[PDB]
Design a protein around this ligand. Structure first.
Ligand code: HEM
Length: 147
């Protein structure tokens, strides 16, 4: 369904520097949902600022994890069904720590923003639709974990 090449070629722009792009995504995510900032708990305590967390090792490591899972959706775009069981367990893991499934819609909005910022006009209507469809499928798979 999602045109693989549109997904792959657009992803290569951000996958180059995952951490930098990941930050852009999370900055927009925290602006859309401030309530997420506290959900990051290290060996106790959290982050005073959106910006303070962007210094935490755990938090940066999480950026990387997020981008790796999006990378898996890209390398499995021609057969996302294979990822279903992994994403369901990932969904459960997030439910376990207090994240609401609805927050993953915000992540999607944030992902598109990150792509808009990086690609500009190269982020075409067709590319945008492909991403909405891909990410929508990822989140559908993850929703199996809220059981
Ligand atoms: C919606 C906002 C999100 C919040 C508040 C959140 C929060 C967390 C927290 C607290 C952890 C446990 C600590 C850690 O392992 O770093 C975690 C783990 C993880 N998250 Fe997220 N997360 C969010 C979105 C995402 C997204 C969109 C993805 C990718 C699809 C993702 C991928 C992962 C992975 C791969 C792990 C490690 C799972 C494991 O321990 O096996 N997270 N997340």
């Amino acid at each position: 369904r999602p045109e693989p090449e549109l997904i792959r070629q657009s992803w290569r722009a951000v996958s180059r520097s995952p951490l930098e792009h990941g930050t852009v995504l999370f900055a927009r995510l925290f602006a859309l949902e401030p309530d997420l900032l506290p959900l990051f708990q290290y060996n106790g305590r959290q982050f005073s600022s959106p910006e303070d967390s962007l210094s935490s090792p755990e938090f940066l490591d999480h950026i990387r994890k997020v981008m790796l899972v999006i990378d898996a959706a890209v390398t499995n775009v021609e057969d996302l069904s294979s990822l279903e069981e992994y994403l369901a367990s990932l969904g459960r893991k997030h439910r376990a720590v207090g994240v609401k499934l609805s927050s993953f819609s915000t992540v999607g909005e944030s992902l598109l923003y990150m792509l808009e910022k990086s690609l500009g006009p190269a982020f075409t209507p067709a590319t945008r639709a492909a991403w909405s469809q891909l990410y929508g499928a990822v989140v559908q798979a993850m929703s199996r974990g809220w059981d």
